[PDB]
Amino acid sequence: RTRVLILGVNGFIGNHLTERLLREDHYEVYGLDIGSDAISRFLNHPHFHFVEGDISIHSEWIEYHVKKCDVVLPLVAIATPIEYTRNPLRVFELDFEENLRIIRYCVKYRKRIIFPSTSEVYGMCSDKYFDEDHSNLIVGPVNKPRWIYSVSKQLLDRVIWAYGEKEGLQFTLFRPFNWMGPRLDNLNAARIGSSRAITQLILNLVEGSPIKLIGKQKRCFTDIRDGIEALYRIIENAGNRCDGEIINIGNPENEASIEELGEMLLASFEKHPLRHHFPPFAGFRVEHYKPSIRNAHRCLDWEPKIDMQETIDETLDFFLRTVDLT
């Protein structure tokens, strides 16, 4: 069966992607990380193999699994805004330099690489719907440090594209738009996956802190149920329709501003069985951004199905029931 190397498996995507692949009968999953607390349910599974490791520290050990496997999924990256501006150099070394090494192992051993790009690469693009193949990418002056993340991920994309063009690297790039659902990534985990904005809000509701509002700008959210299904089809690569493709993965109908998202969580929150176990709501303390999903349609015959309310209730519910009250 197909050997899937998941680098940074101890989190949101690794958990859902693993559960999925394992439901099928033709995948062998090699999940590499420094801890397994988040995928313990899979440790004793016959087709799962935890691999002790760290992409900043290990060189050889990782190169070896790239060669030993068929498809590689690099999920390790610092994807926390405050950090873009706080420890930018560390964000560049991990996100850019260390992943570049993995990309290179992939071209060297002729392996398929499914790389998580970012929805942030579009920047201040005026298109109502961001198009992987046509939208221009707009960022601010170099003196506006917040963009180092976006531009870094973008340069990587370009380098992957270059290897695909001049050296036969087989690949697929995916750009997830605010994925959410059960088993969210810890706010400070350097693993790509779950929307930090919504997990910060749930955190607010859980800790009794207020929801801070810049809350104007609107965003698209995607249920992990719909998102992981898409990712899974990219691994399937039916008819190889994904080779050389860049695919946005989001539900363009779930639009909502920070304040609207918050309002939605509050509602589901106030009606939740465990509501009494959480502090009273602290209150609210004072452009476009939609993805085009044509490529997803084309390459995957994919279309988001879960209704937004359903996603809101479930993500919150699972979170509340998982909270360690003691």
Swiss-Prot record:
Entire protein: shown range: 315 to 656 of 660
Name this protein carries in UniProt: Bifunctional polymyxin resistance protein ArnA
Active-site residues, as the UniProt record annotates them: E120 (proton acceptor), Y289 (proton donor)
Top-rank taxon: Bacteria
Function of the molecule: Bifunctional enzyme that catalyzes the oxidative decarboxylation of UDP-glucuronic acid (UDP-GlcUA) to UDP-4-keto-arabinose (UDP-Ara4O) and the addition of a formyl group to UDP-4-amino-4-deoxy-L-arabinose (UDP-L-Ara4N) to form UDP-L-4-formamido-arabinose (UDP-L-Ara4FN). The modified arabinose is attached to lipid A and is required for resistance to polymyxin and cationic antimicrobial peptides.
Keyword annotations of the record: Antibiotic resistance, Lipid A biosynthesis, Lipid biosynthesis, Lipid metabolism, Lipopolysaccharide biosynthesis, Multifunctional enzyme, NAD, Oxidoreductase, Transferase
Record has Lipid biosynthesis as a keyword: yes
Effect of E120A: 100-fold lower specific activity
Cellular compartments per GO CC: membrane; protein-containing complex
Family to which the UniProt record says this protein belongs: In the N-terminal section; belongs to the Fmt family. UDP-L-Ara4N formyltransferase subfamily. In the C-terminal section; belongs to the NAD(P)-dependent epimerase/dehydratase family. UDP-glucuronic acid decarboxylase subfamily.
Binding site for UDP-alpha-D-glucuronate: A79, Y84, T118, S119, R146, N178, K212, L213, I214, G215, K216, Q217, K218, R219
Subunit and partners: Homohexamer, formed by a dimer of trimers.
Induction comment: Induced by BasR.
Annotated positions binding NAD(+): D33, D54, I55
Chain segments carrying region Dehydrogenase ArnADH: 1-326
GO biological process, one term: UDP-D-xylose biosynthetic process
Species whose genome carries this gene: Escherichia coli (strain K12)
GO molecular function annotations of the record: identical protein binding; NAD+ binding; UDP-4-amino-4-deoxy-L-arabinose formyltransferase activity; UDP-glucuronate decarboxylase activity; UDP-glucuronate dehydrogenase activity
